[PDB]
Ligand binder design. Structure first.
Ligand SMILES: [Zn+2]
Ligand SMILES: [Zn+2]
Lengths: 9, 60
């Protein structure tokens, strides 16, 4: 699956 | 939080943390999902198939 890490915790 | 920042997920909140995309391009369940809202372990990848809680119950 597409996953991402975002800046906001 | 800028009011223009899109919201996502079951929880209807902005992006944060690790998120996973529903495999359905036409997802009406929130498109992207915070790992914690959908039972996934933070800071892990998810290489295989995944539908959100709505799309995984849709009839095929
Ligand atoms: Zn969420
Ligand atoms: Zn979906």
């Amino acid at each position: 699956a597409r996953t991402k890490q975002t800046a906001r915790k | 939080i800028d009011p223009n920042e899109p919201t996502y997920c079951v929880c209807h909140q902005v992006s944060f943390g690790d998120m996973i995309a529903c495999d359905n391009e036409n997802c009406q369940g929130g498109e992207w999902f915070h790992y914690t809202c959908v039972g996934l372990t933070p800071e892990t990848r998810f290489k295989g198939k995944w539908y959100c809680p709505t799309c995984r119950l849709l009839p095929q």
